Amino acid sequence: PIVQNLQGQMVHQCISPRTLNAWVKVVEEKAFSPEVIPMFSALSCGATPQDLNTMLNTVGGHQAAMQMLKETINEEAAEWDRLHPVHAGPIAPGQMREPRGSDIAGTTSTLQEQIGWMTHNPPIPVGEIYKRWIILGLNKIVRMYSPTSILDIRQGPKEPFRDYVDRFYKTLRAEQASVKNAATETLLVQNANPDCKTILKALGPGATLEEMMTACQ
Amino acid sequence: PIVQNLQGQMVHQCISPRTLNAWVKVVEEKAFSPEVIPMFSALSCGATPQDLNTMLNTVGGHQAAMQMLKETINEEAAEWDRLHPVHAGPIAPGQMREPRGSDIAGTTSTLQEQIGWMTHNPPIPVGEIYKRWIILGLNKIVRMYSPTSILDIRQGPKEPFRDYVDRFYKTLRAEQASVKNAATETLLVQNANPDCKTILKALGPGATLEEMMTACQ
Amino acid sequence: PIVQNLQGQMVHQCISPRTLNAWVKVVEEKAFSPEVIPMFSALSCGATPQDLNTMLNTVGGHQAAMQMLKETINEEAAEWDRLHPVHAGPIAPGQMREPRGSDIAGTTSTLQEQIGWMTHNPPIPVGEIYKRWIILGLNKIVRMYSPTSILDIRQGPKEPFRDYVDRFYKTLRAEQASVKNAATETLLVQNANPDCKTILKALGPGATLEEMMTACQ
Amino acid sequence: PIVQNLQGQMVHQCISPRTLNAWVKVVEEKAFSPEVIPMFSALSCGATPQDLNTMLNTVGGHQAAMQMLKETINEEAAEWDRLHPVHAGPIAPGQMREPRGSDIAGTTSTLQEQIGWMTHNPPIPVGEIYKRWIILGLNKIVRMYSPTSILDIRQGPKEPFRDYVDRFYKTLRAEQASVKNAATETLLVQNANPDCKTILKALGPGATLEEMMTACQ
Amino acid sequence: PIVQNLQGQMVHQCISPRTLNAWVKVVEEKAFSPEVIPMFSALSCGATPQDLNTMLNTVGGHQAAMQMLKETINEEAAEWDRLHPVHAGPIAPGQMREPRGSDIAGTTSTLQEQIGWMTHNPPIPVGEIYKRWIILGLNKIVRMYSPTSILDIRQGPKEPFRDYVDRFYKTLRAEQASVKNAATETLLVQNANPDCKTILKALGPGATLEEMMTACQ
Amino acid sequence: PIVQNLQGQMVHQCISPRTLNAWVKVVEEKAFSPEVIPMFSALSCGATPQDLNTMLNTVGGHQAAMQMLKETINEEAAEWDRLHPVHAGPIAPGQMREPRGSDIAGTTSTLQEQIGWMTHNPPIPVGEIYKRWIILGLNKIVRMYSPTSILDIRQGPKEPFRDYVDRFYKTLRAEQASVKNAATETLLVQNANPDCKTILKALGPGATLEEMMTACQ
Ligand SMILES: O=c1[nH]c2c(Br)cccc2n1Cc1ccccc1
Ligand SMILES: O=c1[nH]c2c(Br)cccc2n1Cc1ccccc1
Ligand SMILES: O=c1[nH]c2c(Br)cccc2n1Cc1ccccc1
Ligand SMILES: O=c1[nH]c2c(Br)cccc2n1Cc1ccccc1
Ligand SMILES: O=c1[nH]c2c(Br)cccc2n1Cc1ccccc1
Ligand SMILES: O=c1[nH]c2c(Br)cccc2n1Cc1ccccc1
């Protein structure tokens, strides 16, 4: 990554073994549960494109997902190039060249180039632009791999309301409803069991989740 | 987080993998036992709003609680805005803008903005203001998820007084009696078993817990 | 804690995850065995009052003990205030105020105040004063939770002398005899089994523990 | 490795125990699965030739592979020497000598020499040149140890399409098809089971993997 | 401990959790096997007397040994005082006082005093003087707790010579023969089994251990 | 060890707990498999003689080997003294004395002396000279403890060629053939099973290992 040292300058630091292992193990344990995305983002704090590729490339399973992610990346890289075309032919000697989509994705740019963009004044934050693309991809995968429709999360007749709500919002998070506060006074009540539904209906509209959860305790 | 380096300046540091993992595992092991709150506070030492959101967002279960927490956050953000409205329209070029509730919660502010507030002279401690909101939320959840009323913590006929007292104060902590020294010379004696109650009554009022615990040994 | 950096100034550092976890796990594994106290002291090296409270507050069990400890703290805080009363009414603008008992215990003082006391010239070592109070409390708990009287530690007829001595001094440590060198040429011999007692009596007085242990091998 | 310190100069740092252990354990757990290569590259960030040899030499099993890797190294070293022959006889006193193939591979050069090349202006990046050779070798091994031909990865009649695709791209990665986006609209469909193949044929050409995977859900 | 920082000055650093845990666990796993002593010495690198006491005091078992160690310490402290008596009565204001035995053992000296001695020019290395005393004590314990006389380490009729030699030198190390090279051409041969003894006798005198071990393979 | 800090000067640093534990555990897990030697070398990066002795002395088993290693050390120390005799009698006040064999092995020199040699201009690299001696010793032990002659590594009739080759080069590494590329087109083919031998003979001479391994797949 690029870090500030103990004296203020932005400099390159090797990716730690700790970071490398943390990311690999989160994917091993959680696959594409939605909580993997914020973890990915945090573990990739300060990352260069190189570092991003390293993290992705260290994943051994899930190669259908990694291939889908390459595809998303390629789509975002092609839109980058449409928005910001680069002058072809030879670069002014010693000068910074402008990044293309593939340079941002770290496939046709060197670490040194990446460091130059990222630390230039003003900076071209290639690592953050690429991260956004990867996260866009990752979110598609989380949605695709969501195993259950929100329509099938219904409270069991003996199921504690809290366990139902946990299932419902974990499902909603994966399906990626933006709806989130919203769905509360509608689908969540509809999919509640008969006894709880009666209670919740009686509360009247505008009930907070806390209120709903106390009511159905 | 924002830290002081080895030379005195306040600067941004990536959240560690160690920190990230510690928080995720505490929630996995302890759920919303009350001791999770001081741990959260300590693990979030120096946090920006971004860092706070990261920590929250890395939690995979308990999505009923995380949704209740968003709600509390939204309530505190709306009261922030009532207390400190911000001039609308365009900001003076290059100048610091004033934070709104959603900026404090990290949803409409950038890391750079956050860093500027937090390190400005005088500082606007957005990370500490947000932390207070999250802790307010978290405390509601701890109370809600407390499984037993203090009224049901009564000493077993064969139950060591110390184990009873441990149960009683662990329950009181979750229910969040402010009462804490208080409840000592009342409910704790009332809920003691017949033999211990007799002993404790004989001690007279004003007995310290230590005295009570020795007496009922 | 407050640490010296790599350039000589005293500055605040966040409590580490490593420290936090170490303390929680020692309490989980060892409860109030006497060796927990020196560990607590060492893990709290450089601690502010805030840090002390964090460590205490992260303990999830043993709430009878934590309540007894609050009580001891309150007693020491009240004696602090008797010894060092503070001028009431408004503080000189910008100046350091004097700490009261509750400020030392971190309940009515801010981190910033604490840092100011601890790094002032001359310093008011609030973290060390509070630590002393907590250790006084903790020692009471270790004594209370000692499961066996020294009077009941007697050598088994088939019990190796070394295992007996280990039991005897582990018990004495918990009961907190100051006696420690002392009890050696008396109770330790008295509570030895018949064969070893005969041997030890023959050695004559003034025998070192090493001498006793060789003799009864 | 060679790192930049907290003040800007490039200096030698001992390889960490953490790094050493991470590499040894990845090889123990994953052998020559293709994801070991990006891990190797990342763990060897900043490595000198010495460090590269250390990492390789710490591997205890797989000595057929390590011998094949020496062979590849020797081939690349011999081509280095063909491209960049070095003046024989005695070196100018105090001056940097030019590296030969074996110097780049760390077998006839000292750490000090290596440090001098790597930090000279302009640098001779011996550690990166050697790393490229090792990775060339390693890729040959990954291909050789790939257990299954892509021709034998065919979807089971009851096999979820996603699990098939995972098998297919994991196999392709090992066999090292450059084809990767390519093989998607051909072999992947051909090797799909009858029901999925029918669905995929109906989609028409140009289907993205995401589209294919949704279709065969 | 007292360390040199990244700028050359000697300063106090808190004992790490890592160090604390390492020492406690070595004692738990190995008790007073002789290899614990060099580990103790290395873990206590740079230690103040305070730090030494911390490490000792964190040990929960083995209290017979810890008491024997206090005794040794007291003996060395009393000889210190015989060799280096200190002027009684009040110290020159602001000046360094001279350490007594108990100051060196950290029982009547403050951390600040200890730091002053250790970093004075010229230094009074109180931490190293105390460490020597503790190691003297520890060595007595290792010898006392050695379970087997060297006289009882004899090669089994089916026992590989190498396993015998391992037993013999592990025993000798505990009993603390200075003899070590020595005992090689005598007791080690005497205690060898009949077939190996014959072989070894034939080698003639002056055989190296390597030679002996090859011979009896 | 002696390290360069964050400002360029060579200074002493305590051996880490991490390093100490890593070395002890490698010996526990792998004994004297040949891969222990490069690990030892890497873990001892920057070591003083003191540090080298620490690492060796922390090993609890294998005392036959540790004794053989002392012997090798003594032999190298005696040859050092033959090559570089030192002027006897008193040293010039304040000046660096010249190291003898035993000073290099850390038995008659202080840490301070060692630091002075190692950081003098020009340096006397006592830690690297001693390391070379220890590695010479260690290599003798690896060879001695090799359990199988290369002559007995022959491919099983049902044994995959790759597993045979792994056995053969792991054995050769321990026996310490310099032969290594060499033995490839001879003994390795000779010790192959009948079917593979026929295949390999047909390839003709000059086959690379890769070629051999593909052929016998
Ligand atoms: O090097 C890698 N490995 C990647 C993985 Br694994 C998943 C996603 C993108 C990756 N990239 C960059 C890249 C390559 C080819 C097409 C597009 C993006
Ligand atoms: O980004 C996140 N994730 C959060 C979680 Br998980 C729980 C609480 C608040 C969170 N925030 C900020 C936020 C979002 C939306 C409404 C209010 C607060
Ligand atoms: O915040 C905390 N948590 C504590 C725990 Br847990 C045990 C002892 C004291 C504690 N304190 C300070 C404090 C509070 C109230 C009365 C006195 C002392
Ligand atoms: O020292 C080592 N150990 C190595 C391992 Br293990 C595998 C590959 C190369 C290695 N090298 C460098 C080297 C030696 C001899 C021929 C060519 C390359
Ligand atoms: O504070 C401690 N704990 C010790 C342990 Br545990 C063993 C040895 C000495 C120790 N010391 C110093 C000390 C105390 C009293 C007599 C002599 C030495
Ligand atoms: O202090 C130690 N412990 C050692 C171990 Br354990 C093995 C090898 C040498 C060692 N040394 C140095 C040394 C001592 C005596 C003879 C020669 C070498």
Short mmCIF file of C-alpha atoms in Angstrom, two decimals, chain A residues 4-8 16 18-19 22 29-30 34-35 38-39 42-43 45-46 162 165-166 169-170 173 180-181 184 208-210 213-214 217, chain B residues 5-7 11-12 14-15 17-18 20-21 24-25 28 54 56-60 62-65 67-68 70-71 74-75 140 143-145:
data_model
loop_
_atom_site.label_atom_id
_atom_site.label_comp_id
_atom_site.label_asym_id
_atom_site.label_seq_id
_atom_site.Cartn_x
_atom_site.Cartn_y
_atom_site.Cartn_z
CA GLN A 4 2.33 8.02 5.34
CA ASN A 5 5.32 7.31 7.39
CA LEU A 6 6.34 8.69 10.76
CA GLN A 7 7.61 11.95 8.93
CA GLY A 8 4.66 12.91 6.48
CA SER A 16 1.78 -7.53 5.13
CA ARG A 18 -1.06 -10.50 8.23
CA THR A 19 -3.19 -8.68 5.63
CA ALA A 22 -6.63 -12.23 6.83
CA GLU A 29 -14.75 -18.89 6.02
CA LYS A 30 -17.44 -16.61 4.64
CA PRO A 34 -22.10 -9.59 2.24
CA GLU A 35 -19.91 -8.81 5.20
CA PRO A 38 -16.49 -4.16 3.94
CA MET A 39 -13.73 -6.45 5.15
CA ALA A 42 -10.75 -2.26 4.99
CA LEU A 43 -7.97 -4.87 4.35
CA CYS A 45 -6.80 0.37 2.84
CA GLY A 46 -4.14 2.34 0.85
CA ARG A 162 -35.64 -11.81 16.84
CA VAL A 165 -35.73 -10.51 11.89
CA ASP A 166 -32.08 -11.60 11.86
CA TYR A 169 -32.28 -8.47 7.29
CA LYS A 170 -29.33 -10.85 6.53
CA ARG A 173 -28.51 -7.29 2.87
CA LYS A 180 -34.00 -1.26 4.12
CA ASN A 181 -35.78 1.18 6.65
CA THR A 184 -39.84 -2.67 7.87
CA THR A 208 -39.73 1.46 15.13
CA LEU A 209 -37.97 -1.88 14.84
CA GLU A 210 -37.14 -1.72 18.53
CA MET A 213 -39.15 -6.38 18.59
CA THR A 214 -40.33 -5.59 22.14
CA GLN A 217 -40.98 -10.69 22.58
CA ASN B 5 3.02 9.55 15.00
CA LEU B 6 6.53 9.35 16.39
CA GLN B 7 6.97 13.19 15.61
CA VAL B 11 -2.36 11.60 10.82
CA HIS B 12 -4.57 8.91 9.31
CA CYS B 14 -5.28 2.26 8.19
CA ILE B 15 -7.36 0.16 10.52
CA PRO B 17 -6.20 -6.50 10.55
CA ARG B 18 -5.70 -7.24 14.19
CA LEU B 20 -10.72 -5.86 12.47
CA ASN B 21 -10.45 -9.45 13.49
CA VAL B 24 -15.53 -9.52 14.57
CA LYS B 25 -14.54 -12.32 16.97
CA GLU B 28 -19.10 -13.88 17.40
CA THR B 54 -16.18 -0.53 8.82
CA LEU B 56 -20.10 -2.26 12.24
CA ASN B 57 -20.35 -3.42 8.66
CA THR B 58 -17.97 -6.30 9.22
CA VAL B 59 -20.44 -8.00 11.49
CA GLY B 60 -22.19 -10.74 9.56
CA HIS B 62 -27.21 -9.97 14.27
CA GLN B 63 -28.77 -7.96 11.48
CA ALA B 64 -31.89 -7.16 13.54
CA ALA B 65 -29.55 -5.39 15.98
CA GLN B 67 -30.86 -2.42 11.76
CA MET B 68 -32.01 -1.16 15.19
CA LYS B 70 -29.08 2.35 12.10
CA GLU B 71 -32.37 3.61 13.46
CA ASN B 74 -30.71 8.23 12.29
CA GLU B 75 -32.53 9.63 15.32
CA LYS B 140 -30.31 -0.23 23.85
CA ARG B 143 -30.79 -4.08 27.34
CA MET B 144 -33.13 -5.60 24.82
CA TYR B 145 -31.18 -8.77 24.51
#
